[PDB]
Amino acid sequence: EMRISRIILDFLFXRKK
């Protein structure tokens, strides 16, 4: 349960993997 973190995460990984 996060915010933009998840978005960083997305920037981190894409949260695609």
Curated annotation (Swiss-Prot):
Location in or out of the cell: Secreted
Entry similarity comment: Belongs to the ComC family.
Entire-sequence positions represented here: 25 to 41 of 41
Signal sequence annotation: none
Protein role: Acts as a pheromone, induces cells to develop competence for genetic transformation.
Organism (species): Streptococcus pneumoniae serotype 4 (strain ATCC BAA-334 / TIGR4)
Record protein name field: Competence-stimulating peptide type 2
